[PDB]
Amino acid sequence: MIVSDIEANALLESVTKFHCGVIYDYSTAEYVSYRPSDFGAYLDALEAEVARGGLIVFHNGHKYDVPALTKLAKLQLNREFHLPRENCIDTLVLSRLIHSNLKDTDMGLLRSGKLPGALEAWGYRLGEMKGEYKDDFKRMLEEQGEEYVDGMEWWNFNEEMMDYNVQDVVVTKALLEKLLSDKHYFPPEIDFTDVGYTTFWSESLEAVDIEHRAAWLLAKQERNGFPFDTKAIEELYVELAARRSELLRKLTETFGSWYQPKGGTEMFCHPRTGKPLPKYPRIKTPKVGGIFKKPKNKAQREGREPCELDTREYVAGAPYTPVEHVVFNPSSRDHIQKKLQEAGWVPTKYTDKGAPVVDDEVLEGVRVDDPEKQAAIDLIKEYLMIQKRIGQSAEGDKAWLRYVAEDGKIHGSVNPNGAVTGRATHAFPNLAQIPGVRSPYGEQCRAAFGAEHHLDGITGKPWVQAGIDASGLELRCLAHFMARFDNGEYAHEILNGDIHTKNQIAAELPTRDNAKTFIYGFLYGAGDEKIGQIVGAGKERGKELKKKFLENTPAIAALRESIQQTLVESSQWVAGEQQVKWKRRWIKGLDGRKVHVRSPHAALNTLLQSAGALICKLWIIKTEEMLVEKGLKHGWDGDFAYMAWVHDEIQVGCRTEEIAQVVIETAQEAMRWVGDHWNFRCLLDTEGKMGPNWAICH
Amino acid sequence: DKIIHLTDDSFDTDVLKADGAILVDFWAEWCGPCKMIAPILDEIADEYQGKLTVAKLNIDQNPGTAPKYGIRGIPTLLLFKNGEVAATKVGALSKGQLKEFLDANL
DNA sequence: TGGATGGCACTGGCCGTCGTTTTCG
DNA sequence: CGAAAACGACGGCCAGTGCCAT
Numbered sequence: 065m066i067v068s069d070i071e072a073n074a075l076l077e078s079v080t081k082f083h084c085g086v087i088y089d090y091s092t093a094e095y096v097s098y099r100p101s102d103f104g105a106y107l108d109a110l111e112a113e114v115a116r117g118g119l120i121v122f123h124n125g126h127k128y129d130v131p132a133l134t135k136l137a138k139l140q141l142n143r144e145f146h147l148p149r150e151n152c153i154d155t156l157v158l159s160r161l162i163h164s165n166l167k168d169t170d171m172g173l174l175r176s177g178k179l180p181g182a183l184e185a186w187g188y189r190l191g192e193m194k195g196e197y198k199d200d201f202k203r204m205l206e207e208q209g210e211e212y213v214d215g216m217e218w219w220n221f222n223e224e225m226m227d228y229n230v231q232d233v234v235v236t237k238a239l240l241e242k243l244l245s246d247k248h249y250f251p252p253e254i255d256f257t258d259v260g261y262t263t264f265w266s267e268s269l270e271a272v273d274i275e276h277r278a279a280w281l282l283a284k285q286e287r288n289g290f291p292f293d294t295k296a297i298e299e300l301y302v303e304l305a306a307r308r309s310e311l312l313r314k315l316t317e318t319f320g321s322w323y324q325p326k327g328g329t330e331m332f333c334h335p336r337t338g339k340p341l342p343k344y345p346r347i348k349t350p351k352v353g354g355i356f357k358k359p360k361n362k363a364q365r366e367g368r369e370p371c372e373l374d375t376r377e378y379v380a381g382a383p384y385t386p387v388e389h390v391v392f393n394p395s396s397r398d399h400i401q402k403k404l405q406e407a408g409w410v411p412t413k414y415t416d417k418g419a420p421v422v423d424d425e426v427l428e429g430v431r432v433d434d435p436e437k438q439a440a441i442d443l444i445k446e447y448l449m450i451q452k453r454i455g456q457s458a459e460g461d462k463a464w465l466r467y468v469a470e471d472g473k474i475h476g477s478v479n480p481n482g483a484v485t486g487r488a489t490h491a492f493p494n495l496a497q498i499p500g501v502r503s504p505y506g507e508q509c510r511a512a513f514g515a516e517h518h519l520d521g522i523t524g525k526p527w528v529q530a531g532i533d534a535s536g537l538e539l540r541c542l543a544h545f546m547a548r549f550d551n552g553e554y555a556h557e558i559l560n561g562d563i564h565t566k567n568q569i570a571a572e573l574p575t576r577d578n579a580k581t582f583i584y585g586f587l588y589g590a591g592d593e594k595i596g597q598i599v600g601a602g603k604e605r606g607k608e609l610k611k612k613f614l615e616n617t618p619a620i621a622a623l624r625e626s627i628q629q630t631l632v633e634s635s636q637w638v639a640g641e642q643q644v645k646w647k648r649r650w651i652k653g654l655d656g657r658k659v660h661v662r663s664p665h666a667a668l669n670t671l672l673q674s675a676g677a678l679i680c681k682l683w684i685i686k687t688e689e690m691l692v693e694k695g696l697k698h699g700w701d702g703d704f705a706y707m708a709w710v711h712d713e714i715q716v717g718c719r720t721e722e723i724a725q726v727v728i729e730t731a732q733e734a735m736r737w738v739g740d741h742w743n744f745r746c747l748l749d750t751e752g753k754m755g756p757n758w759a760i761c762h
Numbered sequence: 763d764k765i766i767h768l769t770d771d772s773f774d775t776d777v778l779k780a781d782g783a784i785l786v787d788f789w790a791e792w793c794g795p796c797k798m799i800a801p802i803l804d805e806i807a808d809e810y811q812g813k814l815t816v817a818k819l820n821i822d823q824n825p826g827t828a829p830k831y832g833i834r835g836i837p838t839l840l841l842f843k844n845g846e847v848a849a850t851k852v853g854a855l856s857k858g859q860l861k862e863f864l865d866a867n868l
Numbered sequence: 869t870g871g872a873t874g875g876c877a878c879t880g881g882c883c884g885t886c887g888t889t890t891t892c893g
Numbered sequence: 894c895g896a897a898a899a900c901g902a903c904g905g906c907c908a909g910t911g912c913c914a915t
């Protein structure tokens with residue numbers, strides 16, 4: 065086994081030069097450094113480890129180092145380099161599995177200070193190395209006199225870079241050892257730093273293998289990217305911007321601008337007494353200014369000529385209140401609230417900090433006498449929605465148009481194990497939060513994401529999209545877990561017609577989507593009021609629905625009961641939270657990992673969300689593997705390409721319809737496989753849609 | 763009272779087309795300095811009667827005029843002399859500083 | 869006692885860098 | 894010429910609110 069890391073001139077997409085690398089060999093207990101000209105020797109060594117059926121350990125190597133080495137080996141040495149999956153270990157992947165309850169800085173992309181809770185020490189250091197190095201470089205660049213530009217720190221190799229390169233490895237080695245010492249994932253009778261690759265995977269908790277496969281597959285997906293119709297979203301931005309302009313025109317006309325105190329340093333004091341009056345806006349007593357300026361002539365100095373008048377403005381001693389002129393901003397809930405109250409609106413919902421709630425829900429119900437202002441409300445709601453679309457599609461810091469790459473695709477990031485439950489997280493941008501096809505402008509947004517927007521590299525023909533989603537996943541997960549209580553009744557009934565549509569009819573809801581929001585809100589202990597809000601009624605309609613549905617599957621209580629007994633010893637209830645005494649603070653996931661439980665009231669959700677997340681994770685894995693054992697190639701230069709994974713859904717680009725039909729059928733076989741793999745008490749299924757884009761495929 | 767209480771709609775002809783000097787006071791009820799210079803203005807209205815006109819404009823009740831003058835602080839005293847701003851001083855000057863402000867501009 | 873798990877926009881307060889303007893020593 | 898002073902466009906940080914999706 066060996067621990068390694070490299071230093072190059074840029075992130076994966078733009079990297080074109082290997083600066084250096086380091087390898088620690090457990091078989092020799094020694095570090096070896098490689099410089100620019102040692103590149104070939106570096107690759108040899110790594111390949112030597114593979115030849116011995118060994119293991120290579122990288123921290124974030126799966127997403128960066130490995131694919132990068134492949135890219136540089138070709139560009140720089142015109143050599144084919146491809147470390148097999150089974151030979152690679154990633155401590156960032158391991159760290160995220162074992163410390164799932166914790167956050168990390170996604171290798172320096174996020175700010176530690178903005179992250180809640182603690183951060184594992186070794187990983188924190190690794191994620192800050194690029195920044196600490198920049199500081200150390202930007203410093204030596206001042207001691208010598210030169211100035212600093214962009215990110216020159218990475219343009220050329222230097223021994224300062226080499227030193228960090230070495231420390232990364234010594235630090236990655238410690239992290240590796242710390243992680244391996246956890247007896248829950250690695251049996252203690254085995255030295256995992258002295259075993260062949262097949263042994264490392266087979267002797268460790270199934271979870272270790274799954275996570276490394278997911279990460280390997282997902283890094284590939286990132287590289288693939290999601291074919292994006294830049295032009296279309298570009299024209300939509302033009303449409304939305306015009307509409308925002310018109311509403312702003314009407315709104316600023318309906319609600320006039322106004323002034324406000326601003327910049328007041330000193331405090332206003334009573335003239336009579338001297339009593340400071342905090343209530344009054346802060347003031348500013350200038351000490352520079354007068355009627356005329358100081359004399360400039362012999363005449364002025366003598367009074368024979370009026371001194372130059374002072375065009376200053378202020379007059380030393382004369383206190384004034386500085387103010388700013390503000391123009392009505394529809395995006396400011398503070399403004400909306402101010403204007404609406406001045407029109408007779410009386411809020412009936414405030415926040416923890418006493419601020420009157422101003423969301424669409426309350427706006428929807430606001431009523432004022434003035435017809436014009438009353439109508440302005442409908443314009444404010446539109447403006448907010450329009451803005452939301454612009455924010456996400458063009459203007460925000462993570463807007464689609466700011467992330468489309470040269471290859472006409474958006475390479476969103478994925479943290480395969482970013483959520484406690486085992487779900488993944490998505491960002492830059494979050495391709496898992498794209499407006500639903502049925503929401504305002506949903507179709508246009510969704511349609512801009514699609515295989516059709518990618519043209520085959522050889523024929524120039526548009527690719528086809530294959531969309532697959534697990535059917536009623538978490539509800540089938542519930543059925544599995546309560547099977548020991550209802551002997552599989554629910555697991556059987558859930559299969560009589562679509563479950564959500566059926567529930568929709570029973571609850572008399574308007575859409576299937578609304579049945580999904582209801583049932584899950586219900587299953588996870590939403591109060592009567594919230595249930596009302598979800599279905600558009602009140603607390604009574606909520607209590608009704610709770611009984612009506614809990615009455616049907618009373619076993620849900622039994623399950624809830626057992627989860628409580630297994631986790632909690634006893635619990636109280638103070639003034640700012642619940643004080644709990646735990647028997648065990650975690651749940652054993654389907655692949656054996658520990659799944660931290662944050663709260664007793666969320667235990668069931670932790671159980672079912674985790675089961676769904678791990679089922680789906682094993683699923684996308686088995687699916688790609690079946691496609692591959694079928695002779696299909698993963699890549700735009702092949703037959704299919706994973707474009708996105710949205711929890712229990714996958715969107716795959718295909719070279720031809722035929723391939724898309726096979727992908728769809730295969731995903732289905734895969735789902736059933738997984739269900740059999742963990743002896744699930746509820747049959748698992750998936751629904752597949754062939755089409756041009758995301759709007760048609762989900 | 764001999765002070766003109768303006769409105770956005772009346773401002774133009776009461777001020778910009780008045781013939782003779784006119785001192786406009788852009789104020790707000792929530793400003794301490796404003797409530798201070800007020801009394802002085804009432805007096806300055808009689809003392810300079812015939813020499814100029816003293817008018818007040820409440821920027822809350824009349825938000826459209828002030829913006830045209832980039833008012834950044836209050837109370838603002840804009841001295842008009844035929845549609846044009848003659849002199850401009852901001853702050854709750856004293857009865858003395860004000861008279862010295864006018865005289866030098868009248 | 870509670871829907872859950874996440875990303876992320878946008879305002880507004882705090883704070884400090886920084887290029888521009890004015891009357892004065 | 895620089896210093897003291899009144900400024901505002903400006904970016905990094907952060908808390909509070911609320912919308913995106915599964």
Ligand SMILES: Nc1ccn([C@H]2CC[C@@H](COP(=O)(O)OP(=O)(O)OP(=O)(O)O)O2)c(=O)n1
Nearest residue numbers: 533534535536537538564580581584711712915
């Ligand atoms: N408001 C929601 C919506 C969904 N989910 C969870 C549980 C199901 C999982 C995936 O969402 P869907 O794909 O909508 O789940 P589904 O019930 O399998 O939907 P379908 O059968 O329609 O595919 O996410 C949730 O916790 N809260």
Ligand SMILES: [Mg+2]
Nearest residue numbers: 069070123232
């Ligand atoms: Mg690295």
Ligand SMILES: [Mg+2]
Nearest residue numbers: 533534535536
């Ligand atoms: Mg689903």
Ligand SMILES: [Mg+2]
Nearest residue numbers: 533712713915
């Ligand atoms: Mg889904």
